[PDB]
Amino acid sequence: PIETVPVKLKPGMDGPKVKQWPLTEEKIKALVEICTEMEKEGKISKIGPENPYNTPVFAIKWRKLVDFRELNKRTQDFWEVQLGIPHPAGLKKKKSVTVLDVGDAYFSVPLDEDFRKYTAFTIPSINNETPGIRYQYNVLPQGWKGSPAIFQSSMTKILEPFRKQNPDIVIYQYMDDLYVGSDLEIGQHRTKIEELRQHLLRWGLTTPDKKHQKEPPFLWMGYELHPDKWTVQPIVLPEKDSWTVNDIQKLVGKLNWASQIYPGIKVRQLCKLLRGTKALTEVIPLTEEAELELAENREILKEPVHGVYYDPSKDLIAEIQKQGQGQWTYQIYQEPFKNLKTGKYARMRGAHTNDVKQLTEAVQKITTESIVIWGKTPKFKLPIQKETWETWWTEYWQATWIPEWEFVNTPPLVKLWYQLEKEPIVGAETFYVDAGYVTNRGRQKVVTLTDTTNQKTELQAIYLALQDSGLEVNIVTDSQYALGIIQAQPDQSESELVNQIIEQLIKKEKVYLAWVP
Amino acid sequence: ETVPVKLKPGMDGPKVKQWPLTEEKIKALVEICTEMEKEGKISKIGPENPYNTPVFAIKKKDSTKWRKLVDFRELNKRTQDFWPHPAGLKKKKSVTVLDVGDAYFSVPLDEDFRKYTAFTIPSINNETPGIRYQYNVLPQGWKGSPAIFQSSMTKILEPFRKQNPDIVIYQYMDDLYVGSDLEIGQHRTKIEELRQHLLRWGLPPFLWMGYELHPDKWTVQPIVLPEKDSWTVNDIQKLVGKLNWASQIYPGIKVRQLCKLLRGTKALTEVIPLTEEAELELAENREILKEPVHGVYYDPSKDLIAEIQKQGQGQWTYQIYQEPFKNLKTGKYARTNDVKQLTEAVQKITTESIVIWGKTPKFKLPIQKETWETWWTEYWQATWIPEWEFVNTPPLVKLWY
Numbered sequence A: 001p002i003e004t005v006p007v008k009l010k011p012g013m014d015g016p017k018v019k020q021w022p023l024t025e026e027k028i029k030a031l032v033e034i035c036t037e038m039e040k041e042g043k044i045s046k047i048g049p050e051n052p053y054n055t056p057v058f059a060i061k062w063r064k065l066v067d068f069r070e071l072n073k074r075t076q077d078f079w080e081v082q083l084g085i086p087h088p089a090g091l092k093k094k095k096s097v098t099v100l101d102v103g104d105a106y107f108s109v110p111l112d113e114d115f116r117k118y119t120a121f122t123i124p125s126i127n128n129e130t131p132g133i134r135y136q137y138n139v140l141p142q143g144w145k146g147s148p149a150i151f152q153s154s155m156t157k158i159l160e161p162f163r164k165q166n167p168d169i170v171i172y173q174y175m176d177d178l179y180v181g182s183d184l185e186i187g188q189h190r191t192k193i194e195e196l197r198q199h200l201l202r203w204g205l206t207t208p209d210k211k212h213q214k215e216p217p218f219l220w221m222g223y224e225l226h227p228d229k230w231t232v233q234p235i236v237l238p239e240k241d242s243w244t245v246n247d248i249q250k251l252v253g254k255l256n257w258a259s260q261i262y263p264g265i266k267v268r269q270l271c272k273l274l275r276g277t278k279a280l281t282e283v284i285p286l287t288e289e290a291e292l293e294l295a296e297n298r299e300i301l302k303e304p305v306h307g308v309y310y311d312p313s314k315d316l317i318a319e320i321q322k323q324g325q326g327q328w329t330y331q332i333y334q335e336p337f338k339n340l341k342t343g344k345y346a347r348m349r350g351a352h353t354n355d356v357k358q359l360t361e362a363v364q365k366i367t368t369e370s371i372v373i374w375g376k377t378p379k380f381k382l383p384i385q386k387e388t389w390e391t392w393w394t395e396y397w398q399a400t401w402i403p404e405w406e407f408v409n410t411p412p413l414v415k416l417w418y419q420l421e422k423e424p425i426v427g428a429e430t431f432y433v434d435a436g437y438v439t440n441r442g443r444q445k446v447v448t449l450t451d452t453t454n455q456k457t458e459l460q461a462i463y464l465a466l467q468d469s470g471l472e473v474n475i476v477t478d479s480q481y482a483l484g485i486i487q488a489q490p491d492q493s494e495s496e497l498v499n500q501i502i503e504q505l506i507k508k509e510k511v512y513l514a515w516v517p
Numbered sequence B: 001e002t003v004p005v006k007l008k009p010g011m012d013g014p015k016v017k018q019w020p021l022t023e024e025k026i027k028a029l030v031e032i033c034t035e036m037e038k039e040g041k042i043s044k045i046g047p048e049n050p051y052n053t054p055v056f057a058i059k060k061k062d063s064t065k066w067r068k069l070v071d072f073r074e075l076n077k078r079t080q081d082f083w084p085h086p087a088g089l090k091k092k093k094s095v096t097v098l099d100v101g102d103a104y105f106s107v108p109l110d111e112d113f114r115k116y117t118a119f120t121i122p123s124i125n126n127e128t129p130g131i132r133y134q135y136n137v138l139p140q141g142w143k144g145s146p147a148i149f150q151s152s153m154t155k156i157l158e159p160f161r162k163q164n165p166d167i168v169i170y171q172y173m174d175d176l177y178v179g180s181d182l183e184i185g186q187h188r189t190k191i192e193e194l195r196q197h198l199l200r201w202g203l204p205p206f207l208w209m210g211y212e213l214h215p216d217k218w219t220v221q222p223i224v225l226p227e228k229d230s231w232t233v234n235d236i237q238k239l240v241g242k243l244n245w246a247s248q249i250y251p252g253i254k255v256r257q258l259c260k261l262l263r264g265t266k267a268l269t270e271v272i273p274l275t276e277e278a279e280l281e282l283a284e285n286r287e288i289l290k291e292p293v294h295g296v297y298y299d300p301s302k303d304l305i306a307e308i309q310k311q312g313q314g315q316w317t318y319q320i321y322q323e324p325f326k327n328l329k330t331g332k333y334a335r336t337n338d339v340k341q342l343t344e345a346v347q348k349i350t351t352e353s354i355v356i357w358g359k360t361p362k363f364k365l366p367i368q369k370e371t372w373e374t375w376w377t378e379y380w381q382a383t384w385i386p387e388w389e390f391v392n393t394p395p396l397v398k399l400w401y
């Protein structure tokens, strides 16, 4: 058998001393049968009046279910499961892959003797004046806090040997599922499997027979898994006339899921339907552009596209495109334009930004993603020129760094629609703004702004200035705020005001922005 | 015999997450840990250990060898205090830094504390559980180790100490700062003497390239004002702004005269001749700035803060202060990419904080976390790790340095 993992209750707490609900004699009868067998098997053992602990049991043919919530509340935290699932692109191709169901694994693993007492429950006796049988577990209780972790752990130790003995094979654990991949000949692969089931069996570990095992493809948490390729479970778009906020929200959901493999999915127009929505049941009619998008997507979906697996041998190449203002599309591949995975990036970090910054952020997402999936960073191919990047780079207060990248002339090319002058302009008029401005040349304009906020008035002034000024302007302001914003050379913003200004800026020949107290 | 250590009252163990590592680093970490396992330094752990500290693989200076770096930052914070700094050291001409971390590997760790030293070698794309371990011996990077090894340490050092009293020796975490004023040639040789004298007892590389810090030469970068031929309206305005700012530190700074030059909505480029009054006012402002503000004393009981500003072209600016505007020190740093430079900086700055006060500062970094988290380990070389947080450098503070 396997080495016991020592368990303890949470500090300062005591075992579950919870009362057993009343049980129907028909249910009492069913339990006893179940418990006897379990005892006959060693899973539990009758105990005495010594143990004051108890955990509820109820009947759900008949089945046995024990309520471990309370014990679990009193049981220590474990390093747990993993809640970190591999992403199909992270995998490598395999000739064969079989999966076995570690039938009732927990019940196959012992339990820290010292902990056993806390698992004590009670099967009430049928007649009044008589006592009810008391038990406790000897193995991992179904539904108990530990079980999962402890079960996996032991599994791994059990698998550890065979693993190093059979290098030409790989195994993945997930709950009670054991996946075995190999690049062996079906026959050899299929026997190695049997070679494995025995090793498990050698530890009373039982698994389904080939006659009833599961072979590819696999529908795993939104996926369809073939030995040589992967994709996402098929996605069917509705064809309703009436679309509800809820239906739309879901559609947008499913649509995103696709994103990772289906390139060019677009959800802008649909997402727009959610504006102002007052109820989850509210119906929203589709826009002309929403219908267009839905239909465009419907088509992209009609095409069964698939992902390729990681070939550790080849490098990773990442390619990024601007799909829309704020939208970026990318695809990681190893072999020429034959993706392992793809995806989008709409992440606007901050009220205002520019494609350079936003593109650079896309790079960091991908970089993180890659490291998480393939353990390495991909060589990037971006629609920006080094000179452009380097320029914005060295001139931005925040430190940044982009891996290895190659300029790829694939329109549109991200750029800087304007650059503030490092030195004030001679011959260019000078505006002193504050809601209004005054120029060295005598001109002045004041305007009554309604509803505005302190800061929003500072940009208005400036806007006003730019407007009236000729191609070359000098602008002095006291708002550090607006200065930061414009010094940051944004080319897009959630605020319209800011966009208008940005427009002005692009058009100018030269603009010098200065600050003063 | 193991000295019973405890976490500050009430405090539980760390359960810090592990940042995604690159396959290569994971490999290094596996090779290392497997040998440390063979040598009984560590031991695999089960699921009954819910705690975790982040590990990393960094690169040794002048070696193909990797170094395992454990971020026991959180643990050290939940670790009980233990019950000093040679102000002279900062004065020596040459301070060399040695890594005496392996010292600890020959000292068992209180069995009960071990569970808290838990760490994990993650696995790629979560295809495997991850490799979990905990220490049996004193772990490098844990604030505890120096302490417990303190005794056994002083012994080892008492002979050399008396033999070469012209030498100052300071230990910090896994580092040992050796200082003197001997001719560089001598310094280096006497150092090597210590190395072998350390070997004489048991398992020491040269940190920082085996090269020397020259603390004697460290100097405060004062605020400076643009000295130019002709002064235009813009120049002045900038000047005034900057002064105005600096005023909050040195309240002796007057602008009255300079601002008078700025009366009337003139043109930025218009050249303004300075009146003698202002000329003298500036001159005074200049002299006032010639040195740090008096009254800035270091408080051993306050956190040491360190902010860095990106100046561009491989140039950076920093300041060590405990109280706002009350800089205990300020400096510059020139080259690489933004990140490399930046890390190199932090490390320089830290090393000094230690050398000078014996405490690592807490930095404020002008960078996006995800980024830092990604590349810092690529250039990092120290054995310690400062506390850090990420910020947004204001446009003007940069212009003022």
Ligand SMILES: CCCc1c(SC2CCCCC2)c2cc(Cl)ccc2[nH]c1=O
Residues within 6 Å of the ligand: A086, A091, A092, A093, A094, A097, A170, A171, A172, A174, A179, A180, A181, A216, A217, A218, A220, A225, A226, A227, A228, A229, A309
């Ligand atoms: C067991 C090794 C992991 C692995 C798998 S199992 C895959 C593990 C996660 C759960 C679903 C199945 C895999 C499966 C298919 Cl269908 C094709 C290629 C593959 N390549 C691989 O490296």
